[PDB]
């Protein structure tokens, strides 16, 4: 994506009803800090999800260690809060060649103060004045009270610790809802007239697969015989009517 | 080729009660295989963090590690008068292993 | 990034003249905004605030003429109607912002002349 | 929006008798000339089906009667309509017909039906408004005459239009169109059919087989619903509303054991309920 | 009542390469809430220092602020031929805000 | 628990000097062991591994001098012979162990000086 917002108004995208391309995530390998939870990153290729929350923002190259489920520091204190029990992956890389511009980048912002720690996954766009001391400023700025937000200072004159990271966070769950977003798997070349173990679409058995002229209705999957055996199946990748003997 | 390390800064003269972030950057994406050491000059390198995110016996949470991939972080917090020494990061990803050039935290 | 102002002109005393000032580059919405006055040869005298992030309006009691201030936030614009005029207010006005130790957002309009006189 | 015209009308729901009706294929498995028996939710034969009218002219002059109630889902729902000129688009299926629950919003906006499972705010008299854009000379559909808010949305999908015309037939088809809606085990599945009918209104003796259209992850139980409508605007005559006439058929499903007779091509003709008599 | 400002001197005709200290004094104890502006007569007031002790983008350290409480200081150093203009201090402590009367640094 | 080293000293270049390092408390046998180098003022530079649990020897190609490494497992001791010397290798060596995300066994010897020079 071409434009991530800051952490005071981070973008959140509910994603479901599609398939996961988890391969090139690991094959990317241009990513600085790439960690995961729940169960191992190699294991998560197939172990799939009801409803994922993909929310992303841009933070500094020093504060990214604050982004960890159950830590402190400003981004996890007042800006964006990972929960106490978390599943997803933190994906983090540098975008110094895009974000930090000569003449100064000050598009980006963050919240520096709030009268409590931040509830998990809840943004804070309320840019009203907080009153640290007791003297009421009441919307306008003044004494004992500061402005809530502040920018970052990004230029390519910054050191490597001050480079902008485009942290995207993937968060996962599991419910009475089905695994609506789920990773695909590779196929096996069809064998005709060979005793061959098989799986089609999760249907499993062992038989001799042949070409067959029995004619399905389109929505259908299996055929069956009188005996409630699985007699004939249709190849999902190339539609064809395959007997099972 | 070899795996290059990048330890930054290579020194930082510090004061009492600080929170110093000694960064060890990597040329490749290393999973978590990075460590940290205490060395007063002439001592044995006392291990501080293993797998870049886990504390060690005898060493309280005034030291605190995090990071993965290329980016690794030494999170020294509430800087103590005994913590001023020469420190080191460490890969164990491939062979050869290299260590960082060291970061001497010292009294201002 | 940029502030534009409504047109100044010569107005008879006792009248009213709404002041429009539109923003560009970044919104009015998340910030406050101010008005100040510069008479020729005189110092910059603050006039009135606006505070959109709640809603509150403060006026200078030095020039307390009920110069009313409110918004058009969706156009990033701000309206202060010149009420209860008197000739010494004949000056140039600016749309203003104060760096209150946190921001650096002090952006100033181009300046337009309000004139309070019976002679055009 | 939420423009509303309740126009409540009296009289008893006109009932009817589904003779052989509402037999879908409750599997993908292809079977040929066998008698298969399952106990599943169906509309049992010789059943009481309410011939409702969304818009009903009873002639004196005009007098268009907008009656279509919010209706409970109960166990399962069957649906049938003719509507040579479409006035029907989708259904509002939901839990509170409001926020606080998800919402099943089927809009067959021409031509890309955009099924929607979201959280909406449905008005007191929801239906799809249609008007004339004057830009590109196209009849748009104002979709917020149904519902005010659209947000939080859980699911979205698009497919080829379920509602389809043929026409040119000056009747003699009526294009009888049936849709079965069964929400369970996380899959709310849609069924369809298109049939010619020469009879004035009610249903023939023929069997109607309904294939599953899409098997979708829903996860929200539906205890009530109402249909949707397409109306328009008119201009000065002695505003315009209630395009044409509208009537449809509704009946509730029920667990029953059917024996299913497939054909050599797997086209089920004869089905028989076991508990009928 | 209001908070009075005291900008001294209200003008200072100066020369090349000077180090002018334009003082803005306050009637109350204001924490750091004072600013500085560049105005050639007819321009927009270009902010110079914010919170009385911090520089600004585009403006090098030839200007330099310090002070707190009542006493605030504009530390102009190595006075440049473009720096000769009408300048201003600024409270933001309470409401109403007042500005100083201005100090015109001008070529001798 | 504890590691002891063979004696360091001043050796002329081109020569060889076997390095002995014996363990105590827990055996060498179940683990690997390493050697590292510290020149004065220079960082800790890894030298070579030993892997008893199969048998394999890896050397740094940065200092690739065929500094040979093998065991005396039954004495919990390890031998790396300083071969093909050159003066910049004049440094202190350590017997080492790496916590490879599983163990915490990083135990370090006392450190002895190898010196490579013709002047004693
Ligand atoms: C479906 O029923 C469950 C209770 O079994 C209820 O919690 C849920 O809200 C209903 N549908 C939804 C998800 O709105």
Residue numbers in the entry:
A (entry chain B): 344 to 588
B (entry chain L), E (entry chain J): 0 to 107
C (entry chain G), F (entry chain H): 2 to 121
D (entry chain C): 14 to 251, 256 to 294
From the article:
During the establishment of SARS-CoV-2 infection, the Spike (S) protein binds to its cellular receptor, angiotensin I converting enzyme 2 (ACE2) via the receptor binding domain (RBD). Like other coronaviruses, the S consists of two subdomains: the N-terminal S1 domain, which possesses the N-terminal domain (NTD) and the C-terminal domain, also named as RBD, and the S2 domain, which is responsible for viral membrane fusion. Similar to other enveloped viruses (e.g., HIV), the S undergoes dramatic conformational changes from a prefusion to a postfusion state enabling fusion of viral and target cell membranes. In contrast to this, P17 binds to the RBM tightly and is therefore capable of blocking the binding of SARS CoV-2 to ACE2 completely by making the binding site unavailable.
To define the P17 epitope precisely, we characterized the complex between the P17 Fab fragments and a prefusion stabilized SARS-CoV-2 S ectodomain trimer using single-particle cryo-EM. Cryo-EM characterization of the complex revealed full occupancy for the antibody where one Fab is bound to each RBD of the homotrimeric S. Similar to previous studies, 3D classification revealed that the complex adopts two distinct conformational states, corresponding to one RBD open + two RBDs closed (state 1) and two RBDs open + one RBD closed (state 2). We obtained asymmetric reconstructions at 3.6 and 3.8 Å resolution of the SARS-CoV-2–P17 complex in states 1 and 2, respectively. Unlike the epitope of H014 that is accessible only when the RBDs are “open”, the P17 epitope is accessible in both the open and closed RBD states, which is in line with the stoichiometric binding of Fab to the S trimer. Expectedly, stochastic RBD rotations with different angles as a result of the switch between the “closed” and “open” states were observed in the complex structures. Tight bindings of P17 to various states of RBD by targeting the RBM suggest intense interferences during the whole dynamic interactions with host cells. Interestingly, in addition to targeting the RBM, the P17 bound to the “closed” RBD contacts the neighboring RBD (residues 374–376 making up an upstream loop of β2) through the fourth solvent-exposed loop, the DE loop (named as L4 loop as well, adjacent to CDRL1 and CDRL2 that joins the D and E strands on the antibody), from the light chain. Superimposition of the structure of the SARS-CoV-2 S trimer-P17 complex over the structure of the SARS-CoV-2 RBD–ACE2 complex reveals severe clashes between ACE2 and its two adjacent P17, suggesting P17 would obstruct binding of the SARS-CoV-2 RBD to its ACE2 receptor.
